[PDB]
Every structure is written in C-alpha cells, then in structure tokens.
Paper text:
Human [name] belongs to the oxysterol-binding protein ([name]) family of lipid transfer proteins and is involved in lipid trafficking and cell signaling. [name] localizes to the ER-PM interfaces and is implicated in lipid transport and focal adhesion dynamics. The [name] [name] displays a helix grip β-barrel fold with a deep hydrophobic pocket which is conserved in the [name] gene family. The [name] [name] has a central ligand-binding tunnel with a flexible lid covering the tunnel entrance.
The structures of the [name] ORDs in apo-form or in PI(4)P complex have a closed conformation of the lid by the hydrophobic interactions between the lid and the entrance of the hydrophobic tunnel. Structural comparison shows that the closed form of apo [name] has a very similar conformation to the PI(4)P-bound form with a Cα rmsd of 0.49 Å. The ligand dependent conformational change is limited to the residues that recognize the PI(4)P head group around the tunnel entrance. Two conserved arginine residues (residues 512–513) make salt bridges with the acidic loop β3-β4 and Glu794 in the groove formed by the β17-α6 and α6-α7 loops. Leu516 is accommodated in the hydrophobic pocket formed by helix α6 and the loop β17-α6. These interactions seem to stabilize the N-terminal base of the lid favoring a closed conformation of the lid. In contrast, the lid of Osh4 lacking the upstream residues is completely open and disordered when ligand is absent. In the asymmetric unit of the crystals, there were two molecules of [name] [name] related by two-fold non-crystallographic symmetry. The dimer in the asymmetric unit seemed to form by lattice interaction during crystallization process.
Residue numbers in the entry: 512 to 860, 862 to 887
Amino acid sequence: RRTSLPAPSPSSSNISLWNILRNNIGKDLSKVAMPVELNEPLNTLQRLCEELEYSELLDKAAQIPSPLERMVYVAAFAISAYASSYYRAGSKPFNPVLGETYECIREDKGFQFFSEQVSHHPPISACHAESRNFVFWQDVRWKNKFWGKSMEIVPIGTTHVTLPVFGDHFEWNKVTSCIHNILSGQRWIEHYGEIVIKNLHDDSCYCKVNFIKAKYWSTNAHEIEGTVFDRSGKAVHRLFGKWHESIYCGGGSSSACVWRANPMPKGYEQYYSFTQFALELNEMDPSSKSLLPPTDTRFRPDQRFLEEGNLEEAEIQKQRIEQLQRERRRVLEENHVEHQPRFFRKSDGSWVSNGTYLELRKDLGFSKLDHPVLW
C-alpha cells in the first residue's frame, strides 16, 4: 500500500475561510458552499472508517474471560477514535454525495467495511463493518457551526460494537469538539462531554471517560480520566493518559499502557497530515477495480483530482456533481419520492445494514444495473 500521494497538499489556501466563516457565524456549515481547495481527499464515510485504525484493541477485547477488562479495552478503542483529529484539527472532508458508498476490505486487520451516504438533507452517513471478533456499526450526522473564533463539531448518533464469542453489546456516545482559533495561529482542538460505555447484555459494569479541559499549554492538556464502575458505583479500574498519545489501565498498585497512537508518516505535513492509515483509503489497486460498485469514493473525480494536485479539475468536477445532485433531489421531489438508501435500512431511528452489501459483492462483477450514476 502506498505511503505517498501523487501530489503535495496545499500548505494553506485558508484566506478563503476568513470571509466565508465570519460571514456565517451561526449557520450550519453543511448548508454553506466552499472552494474545493479547503477540502481534503477524504470524505465522512472514510472518516468513519478511520475509527478502526486501532480495531485490534477489539481483536484483543473479546479474547479475555474478564468482562471488566473487555470494557477497558473497549474504552480504549472508543477514545482512539479522537486520536486522528490532533494533527488534522481544521480540515473539512468531502460531504458525501447522496447515495455514495465506500468499501474497505482489510484482510490485514481482518474486517470488511462498507458505508453509504443515506441522506443529504440532513447529511447522514451509515457504516457497517464485519470481523470474526467484532461487528462494528454506526450512524452519524454532524451539526458543525462556526462561532466567532472556534469551530464546533457536534456528532449525533451512537456507536455500537458487539463481540460474538461473548455476546457483548457495547454502546456509547460521540462527544462534542471545539477547534479553538481555527482562523488564528495555532489551531488546537478540544473535546467536551462524558463518554458512557454500556454493555446492554451485561449489567455488571459501565464505563465513564471524561476529557480534561485545560489551558492549551498546561501539562494536563489533552488529558483523559476514565473509570470502570461496577453496578454499585464503586471504582474498579482507572484509565489515564492523553487521547492523542497513550492510554493506561491501572493507576494504582500496577499499571499498563493499553493503547498507543501509531506514529505519523514521514513528513506527514506535506500530505494533509494524514495517518498512514488515512493515506491507504483513497488508494485504488488494480485487482479491486473490478469488484466494487461505481459509487465507491475512489471513483469520485474531484476527490482524485485533488489527491492529484489539479485544483482546476477538482473545482470543475465538484460543481458538476453538486448541481447534478440538485437536479435529482428535484427529480425525485416532483415524483414525491422518499429516496431509500441501498444497503442500509432505518430501524428505530438508526440506519443499520439491511444485510446485502457483503454477499452482493460475494459473487464477482456486480454490474447488475448499478443504480444511479453519480459521476
């Protein structure tokens, strides 16, 4: 897999953000159009993919007789979702096209990941991933707004992981993020709220993780404080460390480093500050190009022509795609059509896999009236 990118990143063309944001101080940024040079060659379905860069934590979890330690490893997996945002604090990803998909099949870590863009008004992304040790799925929409100085990220939705060999159902919240000084010199991100991890199927244990807010320069910057309590509210295991750096079991008589962020690629800054994991998800190999629907994001031109350094071709493709989506919003609006997304179905207000993607790839070369062209 390719540890480079066929062009370098725009180091900055963020004068644009100045007028575009201080002219939108309360507005849902999903509703505000922006020049493509402010994007990054990834989208929100792949950014949900990122949440499994450390999936192997789960690969250890279900392999432990102790429930509480399984919780501990889960809490580590949960926090690790935020680690990638330390270096990529600002940049917005591509808003997925309605109906778009993304597929990543990793034999390496042994999971199969698929994702679809299921609604555009509002923007909802649905992801499902299958592994022998866990199934990981969720459903999110972002309420991003820019106040005077800092930019807010508000994920809405919950995250579900099950461990079969133990029948474990872990469910926890996403949490808020202010990016302070997103226009000023040093963008520093900060996470707000409490993550609560519940086992639905196990009453024994529940986990609370808190983000310590501290002045940017404190020695407690980016600190976390976690506990795994029993039913009675008494503390069992404590987690400590920093959410971009390292997490630890223990804290008392003994301790262990349960998680460590991978190190960044060599001179990562010149390629949008991606993790190695990130550089590997809009990279397209020869053998897979004959196995996936034409709605996978690697096909998306403006994305690829930005990965390529062609600002003009990207800016062109992008307006083409967007006005096409207006036309089809309107085409199924006049036919009073409630669009239904392809391999996710809505239940109780969550988009879960209907159970069709993996097996509809199971047989080679699905060219079976590949449902609408998007580019």
